[PDB]
Amino acid sequence: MTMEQFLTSLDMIRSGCAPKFKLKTEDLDRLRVGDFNFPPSQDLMCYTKCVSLMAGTVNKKGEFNAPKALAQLPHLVPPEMMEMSRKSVEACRDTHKQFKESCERVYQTAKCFSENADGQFMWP
Ligand SMILES: CCCCCC/C=C\CCCCCCCCCCOC(C)=O
């Protein structure tokens, strides 16, 4: 995946997920630049779950599949983001176990990624 293909994938994942939820574009803009420092609505949390379901890296219960996420990295991120993404996944592989509710499990995993990344981090 090239960087151009990655940037395109962000918008195509957004376009598949956003229309299923009542969201604020401003909130999406913040997640897109890796800024998760605000209380998410329930729909925003479930949007992060929708995105992760599209990648196949969570199940319906919001449980994160770290082995699958790691194996899928070459298909999800460009080469220049591979090592940073691997370390993010490893740092956050168990985050979901700390929460009871499906959407929140995914949201908190994504927030954990955002805290264990570099400046290349972007969320769809
Ligand atoms: C499995 C994705 C690796 C995330 C590690 C953080 C590094 C870079 C962020 C760019 C990746 C975002 C676009 C890929 C969408 C898959 C999101 C999966 O996230 C979860 C919680 O399953």
Side-chain angles (χ1 to χ4, degrees):
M1 172 180 262
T2 63
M3 182 60 75
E4 177 175 285
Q5 288 172 322
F6 175 71
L7 296 179
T8 297
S9 80
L10 300 181
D11 284 336
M12 300 313 294
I13 294 163
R14 182 180 286 179
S15 83
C17 281
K20 298 174 165 203
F21 304 98
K22 180 183 184 193
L23 302 170
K24 297 195 265 278
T25 59
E26 63 260 40
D27 288 354
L28 292 173
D29 288 345
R30 292 180 74 173
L31 300 198
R32 171 65 61 87
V33 299
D35 169 21
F36 281 63
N37 197 35
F38 64 99
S41 70
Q42 193 65 38
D43 270 16
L44 188 65
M45 296 200 294
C46 297
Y47 167 83
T48 68
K49 175 180 164 190
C50 179
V51 164
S52 301
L53 284 166
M54 273 187 87
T57 48
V58 302
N59 62 17
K60 287 187 177 183
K61 296 167 181 179
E63 296 169 331
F64 182 60
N65 189 334
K68 184 166 173 191
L70 290 166
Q72 286 298 107
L73 289 182
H75 298 110
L76 293 165
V77 305
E80 53 269 41
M81 283 172 70
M82 282 287 290
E83 173 60 15
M84 174 283 289
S85 302
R86 185 193 68 81
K87 289 186 283 181
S88 297
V89 169
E90 291 290 358
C92 303
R93 65 188 295 136
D94 299 316
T95 299
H96 71 97
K97 298 178 192 182
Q98 272 58 247
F99 303 90
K100 287 156 187 78
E101 191 278 311
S102 177
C103 294
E104 182 164 42
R105 285 173 178 160
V106 187
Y107 171 85
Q108 295 291 345
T109 299
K111 183 168 190 189
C112 179
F113 293 158
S114 83
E115 292 170 4
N116 292 280
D118 71 359
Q120 294 186 95
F121 182 92
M122 289 170 105
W123 188 257

